[PDB]
Amino acid sequence: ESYSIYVYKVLKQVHPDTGISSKAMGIMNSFVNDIFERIAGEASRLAHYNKRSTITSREIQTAVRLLLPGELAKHAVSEGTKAVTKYTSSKKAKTRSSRAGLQFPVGRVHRLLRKGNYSERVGAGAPVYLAAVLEYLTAEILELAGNAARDNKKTRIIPRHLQLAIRNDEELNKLLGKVTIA
Amino acid sequence: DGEELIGDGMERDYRAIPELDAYEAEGLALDDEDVEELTASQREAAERAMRQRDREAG
Amino acid sequence: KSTELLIRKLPFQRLVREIAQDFKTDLRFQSSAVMALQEACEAYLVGLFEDTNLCAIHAKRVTIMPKDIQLARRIRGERA
Amino acid sequence: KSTELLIRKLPFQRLVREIAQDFKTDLRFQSSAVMALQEACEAYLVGLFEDTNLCAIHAKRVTIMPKDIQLARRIRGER
Amino acid sequence: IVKQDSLVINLNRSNPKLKDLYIRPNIAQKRMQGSLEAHVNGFRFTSVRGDKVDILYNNIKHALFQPCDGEMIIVLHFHLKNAIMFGKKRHTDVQFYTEVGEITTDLGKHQHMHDRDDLYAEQMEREMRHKLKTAFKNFIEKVEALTKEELEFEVPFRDLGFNGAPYRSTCLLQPTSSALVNATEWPPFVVTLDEVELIHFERVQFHLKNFDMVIVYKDYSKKVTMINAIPVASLDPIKEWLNSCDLKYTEGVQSLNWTKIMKTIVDDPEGFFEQGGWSFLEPEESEIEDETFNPSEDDYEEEEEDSDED
Amino acid sequence: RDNIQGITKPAIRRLARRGGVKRISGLIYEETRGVLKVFLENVIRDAVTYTEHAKRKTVTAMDVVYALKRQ
Amino acid sequence: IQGITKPAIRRLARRGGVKRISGLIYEETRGVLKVFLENVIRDAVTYTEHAKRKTVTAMDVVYALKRQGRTLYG
């Protein structure tokens, strides 16, 4: 799956005047798919452990707590709960993405969650929570990768800027676990 | 005893040999959108089969 | 780049196809698939060499031996 | 079954409840939970000691030292 | 190889002394044990077998104190300005250490008792450790008083320590005010910070859990010093400590032939600085190859909408 | 609260004896204790996360076993 | 044979921090790689078989690597 245009939206939000190279964009996409598979896999195992047949926002939240390190877990949980309450309080927004105040596609997330056969049923709040977590992690990475690009006096984020952002952050390095990329 | 790795002639290993620096296209094949993305159910069944294969050996 | 060229690409792809002849008799590989394969092989070998040099240092030897390689793999959980 | 519980149950259970206090979350522990923790901790330590003894042999030493423990954990990929 | 002034021994009450010390290096192939005595202008070490080794205050380049906290021994180390000889060959480093105890307890039927008295013996070890550290501290203060600030002992900063392998053995190196030091393992590692021209870090790249650290001296005939296989987690801390001692550092993916580099420099010292000096260590094709992202293949419609509702 | 001191030196000695260790340096005990406190912490951190997902204040044995699968 | 060149083996060990090499290493390294590459291909072709494709793609390689170590490509 391709999340590139949504990563570009997130990049324009944290660093309005910073671009990204084709290899670096492909790196961001593979990170998003990797974590999506990990969080989705953890939410399905939790759904079978409690003998439920449905994955709700609660299953996504506990999965994010288990996989992310401390501060990243706290920040991702906060963003997820905020997007769910925005989606749960107001019906006015035309698109489900703008309903929760997110750039990442909630509909694509919900479609992929159901495609993977992780559970019998997928609740309404789970894809909003997963999209918000994916958006925050992309923002934190792009913020740090943008900070590295500014320090190198480069106008765009190239692969090595991504590597610096990741391994120099303890939690980001732990979360990726030094996945290999070239 | 052994064989040093840091000394004069170290650079000899790092020569660009163009006949060997690139992939050849003998068995390499290019789909031009002919191949398809792997389907989720097939991936699940493949992982199940690989688990069964691993169990029978170790 | 001269530094980045760790494994020559052509002998690696001959070895990939020689292994490919043992699982499915007629196979074709994508250029991106083999390039990912070479990248992964180089990173795994470097990670094993680092552990090996750690084992050699533990043995008070500047030179690494198959003793060190086998110990690193055993602790890593590869071959009993 | 075959496993013998070397670590005394009471001080280990003290340690488990201390770990609960550090996290600052108040939860109860079943007795079965604490024993499963004790079995896993002892098994992990024995397995780590096996790799540690392997490191000591490689150094031509009969005695194990913290050097050996650190090397084995480093290769295992721990922190 | 270098003449040394005769030790000035005064017979009086002021004679600070310290017992139960093993000398490194030894004089025979057997561990010689004796006592260290602080005289007017130097130290006298009296062995049980009568062996006596002397070290002048003016001959001490670095007096180092390693406390027994976190170690099996407590050490006084001395790196000398000029080499001295007391056994066969000449020794440039001389140290005196006292073991904490329990060095090698062995498992078997001898420790099968597994009594609960080890708590009291732990206190006896704690008292022994506090005794050893207090006696070493008192002897250092007496000697630092005697020299009239001619020689200052230095205590390593374990907060700044890191694990590295200079001598093909992964040990702990701790900075001091004047040097980078590891005196717990023989042979010892002493490098004077003042004598360091710069630092170059090799094998620094993603997906690597270790790196080599290269020490280049202001004296260019001296071969560089390697510290191999430091965890990557120790890189940024070491860098900061270097910034506190005003030592310039560089990075490099590829390991460099330093013996060849030094030779090229020494045989033409002038032309080396005309290319820029050490400008080759710090940077200033890959931009042309990579392509910046642009909107392509339109985008997903995202207008599917619908929800479970009730 | 220092209960990582409460894991006895004999208990460390017994664990090494089952592990094949013949001879042990003095500094091992503290290193063993710190390693254990790290490992137990990771499991307990995970285990409590399962317990409150089921909305319970009591950690069960099944919570411990699922956390061990992660490590 | 394997044909993984001795200079390629040397370059790998150099980046790993190795300073001195025993002559036995070259064939030992070749044998170790022969294990590792075989295992990944065994998993990857299985992913290829389940899809009605006779050509292994990069995504098949990445899926096999997820079982051991994740790569962020493709």
- Domain ranges in chain E are 17-154, 159-281
**Looking at residue E108, what DSSP letter applies?**
S
Q: To probe the interface with G, which of C9, C31, C35, C46 has the most G CB atoms within 10 Å?
A: C46
Q: What is the CA radius of gyration of chain A?
A: 16
CB F22 within 8 A of CB E107: yes
Which CATH class for the E17-154 domain?
mainly beta
Short-list A57, A41, C33, CA closest to B43:
A41
Q: How far apart are CA F8 and CA E10, in angstroms?
A: 52
CB C12 within 8 A of CB B24: no
**Looking at residue E196, what DSSP letter applies?**
E
* Mutual angle of helices A70-89 and A125-151, in 10-degree steps: 130
- Domain ranges in chain D are 9-76
Q: Within the 29-48 window of chain C, which residues sit less than 8 Å (CB to CB) from chain G?
A: 29-30, 32-33, 35-37, 39-48
| Touching chains, E (3+ CB pairs < 8 A) | A, B, C, D, F, G
* Mutual angle of helices D31-58 and F9-18, in 10-degree steps: 60
Sequence-distant (6+) residues with CB within 8 A of B38 are G47, G50, G51, G57, G59, G60, G63
Sequence-distant (6+) residues with CB within 8 A of C50 are E208, E209, E210, E229, G16, G17
Tell me the sheet residues that pair with E96.
E23, E76
In one-letter notation, the amino acid at residue E51 is D
Binding-site residues on chain C for chain D (CB distance < 8 A): 51, 54-55, 58-60, 67-68, 71-72, 74-76
Q: How far apart are CA A153 and CA E284, in angstroms?
A: 13
By DSSP bridging, strand G55-56 and strand C28-29 are parallel
User: How many CB atoms are located within 10 Å of the residue D77 CB?
Assistant: 14
Tokens of residue B4, six digits = 């040093």
Short-list B26, B13, D7, CA closest to F33:
D7
Q: What is the CATH number for G65?
A: 1.10.20.10
User: How many CB atoms are located within 10 Å of the residue A53 CB?
Assistant: 9
Q: To probe the interface with D, which of C71, C73, C74, C79 has the most D CB atoms within 10 Å?
A: C71
Q: Tell me the H-state helices in chain D.
A: 9-23, 31-58, 66-76
Subunit contact B46:G53, Cβ cutoff 8 A: no
**Residue G1 belongs to domain spanning:** 1-74
Q: Does domain A4-176 have CATH number 1.10.20.10?
A: yes
In one-letter notation, the amino acid at residue A94 is K
Tokens of residue E101, six digits = 């105890």
Search chain B and give the residue with CA nearest C11. Answer: B20
**C17 burial type by CB count under 10 A (0-12 exposed, 13-18 middle, 19+ buried):** middle
Q: How far apart are CA D75 and CA C57, in angstroms?
A: 13
Short-list G64, B1, F46, CA closest to A42:
F46
Set of chain A residues whose Cβ sits within 8 Å of the Cβ of C4: 182
Q: Tell me the H-state helices in chain C.
A: 9-20, 31-58, 66-76
Short-list A144, A138, A142, A139, CA closest to A169:
A144
Set of chain A residues whose Cβ sits within 8 Å of the Cβ of C43: 180
Tell me the sheet residues that pair with G26.
none
CB E216 within 8 A of CB E200: yes
The dihedral through the CA atoms of A51, A56, A61, A67 has a sign that is: positive
Our CA-based measurement puts residue E103 at a distance from the nearest CA of chain D, in whole angstroms, of 10
The DSSP secondary structure of E42-73, one letter per residue, reads EEEEEETTS-EEEEESTTEEEEEEE-STTSSE
* H or E, element range at G7: helix G6-15
User: For residues B34-56, b (16+ Cβ closer than 10 Å) or e, as one string?
Assistant: ebeebeeebbeebbeebeeeeee
CB contact A22 to G (< 8 Å): no
Q: How far apart are CA F17 and CA F10, in angstroms?
A: 10
Q: Tell me the H-state helices in E176-285.
A: 235-244, 258-267, 269-274
Subunit contact C51:D75, Cβ cutoff 8 A: yes
Subunit contact B1:G59, Cβ cutoff 8 A: no
Dihedrals φ, ψ of G24, to 5°?
Answer: -70, -15
| Touching chains, G (3+ CB pairs < 8 A) | A, B, C, E
Angstrom distances, CA of residue E288 to CA of A21, E114, E177: 11, 71, 48
Q: Tell me the H-state helices in F1-71.
A: 9-18, 28-53, 61-70
Q: How far apart are CA A180 and CA G66, in angstroms?
A: 11
Q: Tell me the H-state helices in E187-257.
A: 235-244
Q: Within the 28-67 window of chain F, which residues sit less than 8 Å (CB to CB) from chain E?
A: none
* Mutual angle of helices A70-89 and A57-67, in 10-degree steps: 160
CB A95 within 8 A of CB E307: no
Subunit contact C49:G57, Cβ cutoff 8 A: no
Resolution in angstrom units: 4.2
Subunit contact F25:E100, Cβ cutoff 8 A: no
Subunit contact C9:B16, Cβ cutoff 8 A: no
| Touching chains, D (3+ CB pairs < 8 A) | C, E, F
Set of chain B residues whose Cβ sits within 8 Å of the Cβ of E260: 7-8
Our CA-based measurement puts residue B55 at a distance from the nearest CA of chain G, in whole angstroms, of 14
CB F70 within 8 A of CB A65: no
Search chain C and give the residue with CA nearest A182. Answer: C39
User: How many CB atoms are located within 10 Å of the residue C16 CB?
Assistant: 21
Length of chain B: 58
Angstrom distances, CA of residue E10 to CA of A109, C7, E51, E56: 87, 71, 19, 14
CB D68 within 8 A of CB D55: yes
CB E8 within 8 A of CB E58: no
Set of chain E residues whose Cβ sits within 8 Å of the Cβ of D70: 163, 170
Chain-centre distance for alpha carbon A152: 26
Set of chain G residues whose Cβ sits within 8 Å of the Cβ of B13: 7, 10-11
User: How many CB atoms are located within 10 Å of the residue E14 CB?
Assistant: 11
Terminal Cα-to-Cα distance of chain E (whole angstroms): 95
Please give the tally of structural domains in chain G.
Answer: 1
| Touching chains, A (3+ CB pairs < 8 A) | B, C, E, F, G
**Looking at residue E84, what DSSP letter applies?**
E
- How many CB pairs (< 8 A) connect E and F? 39
Set of chain G residues whose Cβ sits within 8 Å of the Cβ of A37: 66
Q: Which CATH code is given to the segment(s) C9-76?
A: 1.10.20.10
Tokens of residue A55, six digits = 């994955």
Which residue in the set B5, B39, B49 is minimally distant from G10, CB to CB?
B5
Q: How far apart are CA D42 and CA D49, in angstroms?
A: 10
Subunit contact F26:E72, Cβ cutoff 8 A: yes
**β strands within chain E, DSSP E:** 17-24, 33-38, 42-47, 52-56, 60-66, 73-84, 91-99, 104-106, 153-154, 162-164, 171-175, 179-182, 189-192, 196-202, 210-217, 225-231, 249-252
CB contact E255 to G (< 8 Å): yes
Q: Does domain E159-281 have CATH number 2.30.29.30?
A: yes
Short-list D52, E287, E168, A112, CA closest to C54:
E168
Our CA-based measurement puts residue B5 at a distance from the nearest CA of chain C, in whole angstroms, of 10
Search chain G and give the residue with CA nearest B45. Answer: G50
Q: How far apart are CA A132 and CA A125, in angstroms?
A: 11
Subunit contact G22:B36, Cβ cutoff 8 A: no
CB E258 within 8 A of CB E224: yes
Q: How far apart are CA A46 and CA F66, in angstroms?
A: 10
- Interrupted after residues, chain E (C–N over 2.5 Å): 284
In one-letter notation, the amino acid at residue C43 is A
Q: How was this structure determined?
A: X-ray
Q: How far apart are CA G20 and CA C73, in angstroms?
A: 19
Q: C-alpha angle E143/E149/E152, rounded to 5°?
A: 65
Q: How far apart are CA E59 and CA E52, in angstroms?
A: 17
